Design a binder for this molecule. Structure first.
Ligand code: CLA
Ligand code: CLA
Ligand code: CLA
Ligand code: CLA
Ligand code: CLA
Ligand code: PL9
Ligand code: LMG
Ligand code: LMG
Ligand code: LMG
Ligand code: LHG
Ligand code: BCR
Lengths: 41, 248, 48, 37, 170, 192, 48, 29, 92, 41, 29
């Protein structure tokens, strides 16, 4: 029936860029919190 | 309601009501004693219950049993206006169907989501009564054949058919170009049309002599549909009521 | 505790419930049915 | 509603990152064949 | 019609991207025009609001705040940056066209997204399976066979009546 | 080879298998699909041997030729024409009033120079089978089990390279446009 | 009979059938028989 | 088995849409 | 069937089968299409061409016009997918 | 031969935790850089 | 085809080892 290599293609192409973007957002927010003095270092 | 009551109703009063499928009842049990050469002008066969032969285990043992099933087509199943000549070979009434609306496409769904289409038909019937006078307690019986559910002009989703259409699966050209080409696919490329057999057993009930009408209960077992030989057909058991009027 | 009492008295004894699955000693004929409680030493039989 | 007074930060050294990466990769190496069977 | 019949161009994902971009561009144009025209400021006394504007104007003519609130209450998300809004308006149709062009370049080499192999098989081994996809394939075969003779006169195609694919009585 | 003087069978048997394999539509780069992944062998199977060149003759001893399918079409009817391009036989789609069916007009095959060299067939179904096979190039023997070859064609490295590189060039034209514009407008590229 | 739930690797279905869930919207029953119009408390109803 | 992948992708897209409406950056003036 | 053997007698050739061809086949023979071809196609299978003349009702004139073209008609084994479509083939 | 579901198991179990840890480290470093004044905000 | 996965895992582990030696946090007193 279907190709058994697509699974890897679809799942990796969905997860890896999504985690990359989540990483970018998290580090942006962490830097923003660090710049402003407060309970977060 | 009887035919004498439906004839009073106009077409506008009947549309939609759903009683077009219903068979008229017969009252006043009596004996007809048909004159030889007479024939049944009208004949309605209404199935009241459908069942399909299936395998199911009761207490660790499986056996062939007929399981019930709800019909998917709405109100199509009933046959009507069947005509046939009644004859007497050795003092036995023989219906011998000749013409009339006798086939009806019907689909029924088994438990588990299985859909079983079949052609509910009475064709080339040969009844053999247990005597003469159509009188309360009469029995007819007989055998009939069922034509193919799909005729030669039908086309498969890939465009293959019997009388017309592609002889092979054009979507897969690599199956050609190889000595023994499409073979595993030959079972589906080849469309076969075979007639089946059906057994019906009709028992007569209250019979009106003034209006020359007979009514009763039938039991039929017909062979199901085979998708042009692709699948083995199933066994369908059906029971219901009937009605017929004899013209002398 | 209220929930446990309700489940035991209504949903297992079949007073207001379907019951529980009860089978034969060899698993040939088993089905769901209400079960009457056993207030005896046999109540602690794990297979009862 | 309001700014929660219980919000702290999260840290991870580079040595901790190396330990975690090594652990994940070695676990994958160990179990890959068994998963493939 | 030729590309639809011979390449199944509608099934190509790049065409789908192109049509998405074009329809989104039209959507953006209409919605932005309506939003701007329906959030104008009281800058005159006549019903005709076109004469209450001067090209050498510094202040804004429509309430960005009110439009943002309206669209966030209706749709759920709204713009809050005119620069980003207009860049999005620029960006959508252009990338739609670029994706469509990539698809056409792919078609030029007959590298077309024509068939779903799994469905084609599963339909080949069972004459009861049917989807709208197989119906589209039948339409493509019909259009191709009936159009080739007159579309390509240099090939001298001659198709007898019994060869042309046709359905029932129609 | 006929002119120098030789039997037709041995004249056709001197053709190398490579040359006949080139004359097959499965090797056409403009025949695969975009998402049909894998090598060609996944599409038809590994070629085993040449089946030999078939020759189609009718009752009057003519030489009918099967019209080869063009590259555009994916389904092409089987049509047999003579030396002057006139229809003589075909496979009818609707066999009701067909006057050119392969059975009404008796057509025979005679393979020359191959695995089936010197063999002939007079039966109806086998002639149809071989006509459909020979509609697309030469006839070969394939192994459809080593790679589980499905029934669908695939494309060359030629087509794949052309496709990838044409698309890359088309994108890089845009890249050049954007970057050159950014060089020229450097001072203003921050706000008017 | 020869293909029970435990033979097919079902892990959650036994826990549903233990407490009284036997019918299914598909018309079949785990006890072999057939069900006509099961209620909301079938396998699919429980999952939803 | 690919029906599971399709369903997962569709539900994930719907969840992303959900988070972009009720967990958005509040725009302030 | 993937290949009916009696293709040529369905109407394509000058010889037409009486147990398979549709009523449109009886158009090459003048004076036969209505009231004559209908009787042939509306009745049961025939073992031989002689079985036509016993067709109930067949008038004389019909018998004469059939005898005129008796050479062109032929009798083959019936096939269900074709006998079902004798009256209305489907094509127009 | 081998199970065609392991591929997904092995690859996802390798990549997702690795990206999670890389995310943690990157956000820690970004917060550290934000806390100290400099060219990074 | 799993030989590719095994080789990738081994080479990735070796690369991680490489980065932990020449790109380590310098310990200062
Ligand atoms: C209205 C509430 C409700 C109802 C009627 C059900 C009903 C059901 N659930 Mg369920 N479930 C619910 C809420 C509910 N759930 C919630 C909120 C969750 C999330 C936590 C779950 C998570 C869940 C899972 C993960 C599973 C079910 C399953 C099931 C089915 C089998 C039940 C079973 O065997 O339980 C058995 C229950 C127990 C063994 C609990 C034992 C209680 C312990 C022993 C208490 C001991 C400590 C206690 C405090 C002692 C002190 C009291 C004492 C002094 C009196 C059944 C259809 C199963 C199923 O078939 O899936 C469809 C299944 O696998 N449920
Ligand atoms: C912890 C104890 C416990 C547990 C695990 C169960 C478990 C069960 N009971 Mg039960 N019962 C109990 C205590 C318990 N009962 C008590 C104390 C009583 C006495 C009142 C009963 C009385 C009782 C009766 C009378 C019946 C059951 C039934 C059932 C079964 C189906 C119910 C179900 O799946 O709910 C699952 C419920 C949830 C997961 C809650 C979900 C809530 C959300 C908001 C959705 C609400 C439902 C919504 C309408 C669904 C929308 C979709 C729908 C349109 C398809 C299940 C095995 C039925 C049965 O077996 O029939 C075959 C049945 O008829 N029980
Ligand atoms: C619904 C729908 C929608 C919205 C679209 C949308 C689109 N289709 Mg389309 N399509 C559909 C259904 C649909 N399709 C169906 C059902 C079929 C079958 C097709 C078959 C199809 C094909 C075969 C093609 C498209 C193409 C396109 C794109 C058009 C590109 C364009 O504007 O070029 C318009 C032209 C230009 C932008 C060039 C302009 C050049 C200059 C500026 C012109 C200026 C001249 C001046 C002179 C003035 C005089 C003049 C006014 C008289 C666009 C994405 C095309 C595509 O994808 O191309 C990449 C394409 O070739 N479609
Ligand atoms: C434009 C560049 C390009 C082109 C034209 C092709 C072309 C092709 N590749 Mg390929 N490939 C490329 C880049 C390219 N590849 C890159 C960058 C990678 C690394 C991810 C791969 C990884 C790759 C694999 C793993 C496979 C192909 C395969 C194939 C063939 C199908 C075809 C010849 C397949 C094949 O049959 O090759 C043996 C195959 O299995 N390629
Ligand atoms: C849509 C087309 C297009 C556009 C708008 C631009 C725009 C630009 N290019 Mg350019 N370029 C293009 C296509 C284009 N390019 C192509 C196809 C090439 C490949 C040869 C180049 C190669 C190129 C170089 C090498 C450089 C630029 C540069 C530039 C920038 C400065 C303007 C300039 O020198 O123009 C270039 C002028 C033209 C493109 C006009 C050419 C018109 C010719 C002479 C007509 C010839 C007719 C022909 C003889 C008829 C026979 C052909 C027939 C047989 C088919 C500007 C952003 C410069 C840059 O980035 O500096 C900052 C720069 O150094 N371009
Ligand atoms: C089980 C299930 C769910 C089944 C469904 C399965 C199914 C059918 C799946 C298909 C669904 C799916 C997503 C398929 C489509 C795939 C597809 C073709 C994707 C295209 C991908 C792509 C990269 C395309 C390239 C082109 C491209 C960039 C398109 C983007 C289009 C796009 C997002 C346009 C914007 C649309 C939009 C609604 C904008 C509104 C903006 C807005 C609110 C403005 C209002 C507004 C105006 C003002 O003027 C001011 C001032 C303010 C303030 C303001 O607010
Ligand atoms: C790091 C991970 C990054 C994650 C993102 C993943 C992106 C995935 C996108 C790749 C899609 C390929 C999957 C195809 C499905 C499948 O399993 O194929 C599987 C096929 C392999 O094919 C398999 O091969 C096997 C050994 O030969 C057997 O033959 C199998 O039968 C056959 O299926 O994979 C590919 O075709 C190779 C991968 C793609 C090759 C590069 C693309 C082709 C070059 C075109 C580039 C031009 C681009 C221009 C764009 C502008
Ligand atoms: C609180 C009492 C609720 C109650 O008795 O529910 C009684 C309802 C009755 O549930 C009925 O059950 C029938 C078969 O048992 C059919 O499934 C009906 O469709 C269903 O409504 O069941 C539940 O809601 C279970 C409650 C578990 C707590
Ligand atoms: C988010 C992603 C997270 C990524 C991390 C991934 C972790 C993966 C680890 C799971 C390994 C399972 C892979 C098995 C390989 C394979 O493909 O199997 C494939 C099998 C499925 O099996 C397939 O089933 C199909 C349909 O039935 C067909 O039958 C196929 O023939 C059959 O292979 O998957 C599993 O066995 C289910 C997944 C694991 C189930 C949970 C574990 C079992 C419960 C034990 C838990 C106890 C743990 C205690 C620990 C202390
Ligand atoms: C009853 C309510 C009916 C609507 C409910 C749901 C509406 C949800 C729509 C929002 C989701 C998208 C938000 C993404 C991004 C988002 O967060 O936007 C936020 C963004 C607000 O930006 P502003 O603020 O500018 C910020 C800039 O400064 C960025 O630098 O809005 C836009 O960009 C315009 C929104 C266009 C909205 C496009 C909608 C896309 C359609 C949805 C695609 C559906 C696929 C479905 C597959 C099944
Ligand atoms: C799965 C799959 C597949 C495969 C894929 C692959 C195999 C891929 C690969 C990929 C890759 C493999 C990629 C890579 C990338 C990389 C990168 C991108 C890198 C980067 C780098 C950097 C970042 C660097 C940095 C630095 C350092 C480190 C030091 C000094 C400084 C500097 C900065 C230079 C395919 C499709 C076939 C099919 C389907 C599925």
């Amino acid at each position: 029936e279907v190709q058994f290599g697509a699974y890897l293609a679809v799942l990796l192409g969905t997860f890896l860029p999504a985690l990359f973007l989540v990483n970018l957002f998290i580090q942006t927010e962490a830097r923003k919190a660090g710049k402003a003095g407060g309970q977060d270092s | 309601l009887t035919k004498s009551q439906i004839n009073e109703l106009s077409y506008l009063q009947v549309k939609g009501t759903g009683l077009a499928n219903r068979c008229a009842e017969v009252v006043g049990e009596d004996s007809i004693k048909p004159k030889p050469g007479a024939k049944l002008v009208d004949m309605c066969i209404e199935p009241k219950a459908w069942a399909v032969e299936e395998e199911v285990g009761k207490a660790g043992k499986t056996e062939k049993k007929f399981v019930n099933s709800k019909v998917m087509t709405r109100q199509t199943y009933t046959l009507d206006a069947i005509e046939g000549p009644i004859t007497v070979d050795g003092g036995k009434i023989t219906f011998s169907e000749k013409e009339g609306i006798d086939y009806a496409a019907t689909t029924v769904q088994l438990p588990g989501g299985e859909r079983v289409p079949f052609l509910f038909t009475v064709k080339d019937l040969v009844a053999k009564g247990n005597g003469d006078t159509f009188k309360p307690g009469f029995q007819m019986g007989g055998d009939f054949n069922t034509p193919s559910y799909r005729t030669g002009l039908f086309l498969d989703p890939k465009g293959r058919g019997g009388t017309t259409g592609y002889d092979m699966a054009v979507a897969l050209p690599a199956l050609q170009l190889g000595e023994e080409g499409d073979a595993e696919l030959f079972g589906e490329n080849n469309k076969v049309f075979d007639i089946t057999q059906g057994r019906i057993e009709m028992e007569v009930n209250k019979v009106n002599a003034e209006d020359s009408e007979i009514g009763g209960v039938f039991v039929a077992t017909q062979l199901s549909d085979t998708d042009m030989g692709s699948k083995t057909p199933k066994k369908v058991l059906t029971k219901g009521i009937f009605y017929a009027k004899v013209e002398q | 505790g209220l929930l446990c009492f309700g489940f035991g008295a209504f949903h297992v004894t079949g007073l207001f419930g379907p019951g529980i699955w009860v089978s034969d000693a060899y698993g040939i004929t088993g089905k769901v049915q209400p079960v009457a409680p056993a207030w005896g030493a046999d109540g602690f039989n794990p297979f009862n | 509603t309001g700014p929660n007074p219980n919000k702290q930060a999260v840290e991870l050294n580079r040595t901790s990152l190396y330990w975690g990466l090594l652990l994940i990769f070695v676990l994958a190496v160990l179990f890959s064949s068994y998963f493939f069977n | 019609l030729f590309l639809q019949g011979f390449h199944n161009w509608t099934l190509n994902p790049f065409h789908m991207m192109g049509v998405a971009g074009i329809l989104g561009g039209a959507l953006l144009c209409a919605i932005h025009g309506a939003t701007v025209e329906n959030t104008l400021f009281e800058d005159g006394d006549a019903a005709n609001t076109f004469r209450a504007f001067t090209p050498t104007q510094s202040e804004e003519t429509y309430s960005m705040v009110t439009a943002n609130r309206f669209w966030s209450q209706i749709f759920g998300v709204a713009f809050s940056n005119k620069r980003w809004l207009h860049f999005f308006m620029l960006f959508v149709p252009v990338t739609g066209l670029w994706t469509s062009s990539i698809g056409i370049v792919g078609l030029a080499l007959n590298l077309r997204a024509y068939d779903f192999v799994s469905q084609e098989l599963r339909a080949a081994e069972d004459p009861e399976f049917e989807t709208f996809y197989t119906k589209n394939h039948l339409l493509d075969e019909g259009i191709r066979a009936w159009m080739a003779a007159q579309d390509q006169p240099h090939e001298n195609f001659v198709f007898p009546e019994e060869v042309l694919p046709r359905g029932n009585a129609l | 080879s006929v002119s120098e003087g030789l039997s037709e069978s041995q004249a056709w048997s001197r053709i190398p298998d490579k040359l006949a394999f080139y004359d097959y539509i499965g090797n056409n780069p403009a025949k695969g699909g975009l998402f049909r992944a894998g090598p060609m062998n996944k599409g038809d199977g590994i070629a085993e041997a040449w089946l030999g060149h078939p020759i189609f003759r009718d009752k009057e001893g003519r030489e009918l030729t099967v019209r080869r399918m063009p590259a555009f079409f994916e389904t092409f009817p089987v049509i047999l024409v003579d030396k002057d391009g006139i229809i003589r036989a075909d496979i009818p789609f609707r066999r009701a009033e067909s006057k050119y069916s392969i059975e009404q007009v008796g057509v025979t095959v005679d393979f020359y120079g191959g695995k089936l060299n010197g063999q002939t067939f007079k039966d109806a179904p086998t002639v149809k089978k071989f006509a459909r096979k020979a509609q697309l190039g030469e006839v070969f023997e394939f192994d459809r089990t080593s790679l589980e070859s499905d029934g669908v064609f695939r494309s060359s490295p030629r087509g794949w390279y052309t496709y990838g590189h044409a698309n890359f060039a088309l994108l890089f034209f845009f890249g050049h446009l954007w970057h050159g514009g950014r060089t020229i407008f450097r001072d203003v590229f921050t706000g008017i | 009979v020869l293909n029970p739930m435990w033979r097919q690797g079902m892990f959650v279905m036994p826990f549903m059938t233990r407490l009284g869930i036997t019918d299914s919207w598909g018309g079949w029953s785990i006890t072999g028989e057939s069900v006509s119009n099961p209620g909301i408390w079938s396998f699919e109803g429980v999952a939803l | 088995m690919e029906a599971l992948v399709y369903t997962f992708l569709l539900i994930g897209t719907l969840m992303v849409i959900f988070f972009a409406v009720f967990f958005r950056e509040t725009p302030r003036i | 069937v993937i290949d009916y053997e009696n293709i040529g007698y369905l109407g394509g050739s000058s010889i037409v089968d009486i147990n398979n061809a549709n009523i449109r086949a009886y158009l090459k023979m003048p004076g036969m299409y209505p009231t004559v071809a209908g009787k042939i196609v509306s009745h049961g299978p025939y073992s031989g061409v002689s079985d036509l003349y016993k067709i109930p009702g067949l008038s004389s004139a019909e018998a004469d016009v059939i005898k005129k073209y008796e050479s062109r008609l032929t009798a083959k084994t019936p096939s269900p997918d074709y006998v079902i479509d004798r009256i209305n083939n489907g094509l127009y």
